[PDB]
Structure formats: structure tokens, C-alpha cells
Design a protein around this ligand. Sequence first.
Ligand SMILES: S=c1[nH]c2ccccc2s1
Ligand SMILES: [Zn+2]
Length: 257
Amino acid sequence: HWGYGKHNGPEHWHKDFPIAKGERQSPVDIDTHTAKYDPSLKPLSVSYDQATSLRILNNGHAFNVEFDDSQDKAVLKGGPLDGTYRLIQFHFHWGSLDGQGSEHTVDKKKYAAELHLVHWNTKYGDFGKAVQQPDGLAVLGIFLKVGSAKPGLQKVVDVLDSIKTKGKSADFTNFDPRGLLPESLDYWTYPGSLTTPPLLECVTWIVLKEPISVSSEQVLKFRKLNFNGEGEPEELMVDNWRPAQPLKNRQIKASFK
Ligand SMILES: S=c1[nH]c2ccccc2s1
Ligand SMILES: [Zn+2]
């Protein structure tokens, strides 16, 4: 099935998922000089104080930290969004080397990794209905660069040894995603898609300008995960990023002058 290799990677996805060549695909290069400051954007509100994580899972493509989204607990609102969007999971994309790994780029610059906090529009009742809607999802994207360690990431790093291979999962309660956010909430926003199959065009992207720093040791631990399942030949989980896709005349808006 789909993946990140020569015979099943991004350049192949369109055969099973023809929307891969659609009009609002992600990620994109963010040309900072062409993005326009928008005064109509309201302040961005990230309210993660009551977030309740449940579990972490290796799905053969990345790892997902899942949240109990049955009550309004961890919500994103404001900015380009109408109403409230509820956090359901986060995951990362990263490289085999520090000079690549992010999905969005900034004036063609690639970061070592990118964090996606996935939220669904509460107007639609749950995630599954939300991904049938052009305003169903909001994904908060955060770049990672290699430098000083991110202490709030260490709990994730330390659990990865227990979910090395595809299909493994572990209990993962009391994880605070506030520990993964940079100081500034300045952002770029544009309409796009999921960056993995099924590549659904339901996302309002909100990409923070300020990266977080993580240590070389932290990202090296991400690169020790496996795409394959237990008892299968080892394929390290690296380069699980889709490259930038055509903007197709969409407009990227900036929240900062
Ligand atoms: S980026 C994003 N990749 C996925 C995959 C499944 C569900 C939501 C999302 S958002
Ligand atoms: Zn993603």
C-alpha cells in the first residue's frame, strides 16, 4: 500500500488517491514575501489546559499521540477559524538528516521536522463527518530545528522504544501538548489538505512562523522507529514527508504585519 519509498511514495499516491493532483493539496512552499498580512484574522486561541492524551500508536507511517476528544477539552479557535475545533491527535514528519524532514517550507527552507496538531470542527459532530467538509479540519503546524533540547518532548521520545514497529501501541496518558509550542503564535494560514492518503481537502492550515528547537538526540530517537512491523526486515522510519505541492493560486495570509 502507500508509503514513502521509490515504488509507493508520494509520486505514486495519485493512482490510488487521484485527489493527490487536486486544487488544494498540501504541503506548500510558503513564500513569505507573497503572503499578505490580514487584519480580518481574529486572535488565535490555543486552549490545551484540559487536554487528555490516551495512547501513542506506530501506524507504519508515523506515530500518533491520540486524545480523548469526547468533550470540549483541548480546542483551537480564533485566527482564520469560525467556531471551535477540537484536538484529536498529533504526529510528526521528519527526515533521515537534519537538513530535511518538514512538509511545509519557508522560502524553500526545509526544517528537520514538522509537528501537526490535528483538530476537527465541532459543528460536524466528530472527525469522520468533519473530513467530509471543506472546513472540517484545522491543523496547527510547528517546525522543528535541531539545537537545544525541548524538555516537553522528552516524554514522547522516551516512549518510542515501546512502539518501534508498525501496529504497536502503548498507554500514553497525561501528556501536555502545551510543552510543544513556541513562544509566538504568529502564523501563516491557507486552505489545503491532509498530507497523507487519503489527502482529503478539508484542512485550514495554520503554520507557526517560530520553530521549536529539539536536540539531535531527540530527533535521532524518532529515526530509530520502523516502517515495517515486528519480525519483518528493518526499514527505518525516516523521510516520512510529502514535498511541496502546487499552490494553484491559493493565497497565503499572515497573521503578523
Ligand atoms: S497532516 C494530517 N495527516 C492526517 C492523517 C489522518 C487524520 C488527520 C490528519 S492531518
Ligand atoms: Zn501530518
